[PDB]
Swiss-Prot record:
Heterotetramer. Forms heterotetrameric channels composed of two GluN1/zeta subunits (GRIN1), and two identical GluN2/epsilon subunits (GRIN2A, GRIN2B, GRIN2C or GRIN2D) or GluN3 subunits (GRIN3A or GRIN3B) (in vitro). Can also form heterotetrameric channels that contain at least two GluN1 subunits and at least two different GluN2 subunits (or a combination of one GluN2 and one GluN3 subunits) (in vitro). In vivo, the subunit composition may depend on the expression levels of the different subunits. Found in a complex with GRIN1, GRIN3A and PPP2CB. Found in a complex with GRIN1 and GRIN3B. It comes from the Eukaryota. The chain holds residues 404 to 539 of 1464 of the full protein. This is Glutamate receptor ionotropic, NMDA 2A. L-glutamate binds at residues 107, 109, 114. Detected in brain cortex, olfactory bulb, hippocampus including the dentate gyrus, striatum, thalamus, superior colliculus, inferior colliculus, midbrain and cerebellum (at protein level). Detected in brain cortex, hypothalamus and cerebellum. It is found in: Cell projection, Dendritic spine; Cell membrane; Synapse; Postsynaptic cell membrane. It comes from Rattus norvegicus. Belongs to the glutamate-gated ion channel (TC 1.A.10.1) family. NR2A/GRIN2A subfamily. Component of N-methyl-D-aspartate (NMDA) receptors (NMDARs) that function as heterotetrameric, ligand-gated cation channels with high calcium permeability and voltage-dependent block by Mg(2+). NMDARs participate in synaptic plasticity for learning and memory formation by contributing to the slow phase of excitatory postsynaptic current, long-term synaptic potentiation, and learning. Disulfide bonds join 25-51, 32-52. Glycans are attached at residues 39-40. Contains an N-terminal domain, a ligand-binding domain and a transmembrane domain. Agonist binding to the extracellular ligand-binding domains triggers channel gating. A hydrophobic region that gives rise to the prediction of a transmembrane span does not cross the membrane, but is part of a discontinuously helical region that dips into the membrane and is probably part of the pore and of the selectivity filter.
Amino acid sequence: NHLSIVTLEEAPFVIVEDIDPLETCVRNTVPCRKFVKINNSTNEGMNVKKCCKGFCIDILKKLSRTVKFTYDLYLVTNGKHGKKVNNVWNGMIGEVVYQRAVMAVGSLTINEERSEVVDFSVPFVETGISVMVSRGTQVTGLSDKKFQRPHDYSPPFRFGTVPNGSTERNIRNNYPYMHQYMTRFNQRGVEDALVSLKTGKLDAFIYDAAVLNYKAGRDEGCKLVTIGSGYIFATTGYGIALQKGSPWKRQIDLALLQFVGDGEMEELETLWLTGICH
Ligand SMILES: N[C@@H](CCC(=O)O)C(=O)O
């Protein structure tokens, strides 16, 4: 009963590394494969062996040990965390919905749309929407006038997010103007956004709270500050996604609860998520 499990890279939850040519993953890593295309024309491709580590990987290792299952971990190839595009789910959520994976482990945010098509374990990392700015910049949260009336400033307040995730969904579904203003500043990824902030090319980066709290905690030079958005309606957590009606949610939940109660979760948080910047 080898379980097919999908994941996605997003430090410090999931970190990917090339395997050692001379061909096994060691230390705190585990095997993870990815289907890579031969070219940009056809569907042809081959699965490439890589190695994975991180907070979520350690959670997977513990679940494997405790629930007593073995697994075949693979990386998503189309999309990221999960979005319904042209009426079809992609990313980690898609792999679970279309039964390619029994579970999805990673920095996967629990939200209403996703819960309609997949079942989630209890949350194990708290998150929501946060705002990151250069240390010194003053903002109260997303209700700040700088965000409500960006054009009332010279130059217009510059803020954006990484599209296609739960953060964009929460803005697009409720505040049309803010969303369409923001697309002007879409960021390709977290690292891109951080550079834009520290060099003064971007005023604020709106993104997942867990990741922003982590990044601000160990920024080189501690030049970044993260503050809550105030969008409490968006407060949620990361959860392991399973097939709708999955018979494993019960056992996965019991394990997570066991880890929380025994202090094992506490130890993992200390190992991977602590910060140093005040
Ligand atoms: N963790 C988010 C991705 C990042 C974000 O949109 O804030 C998700 O599962 O969609």
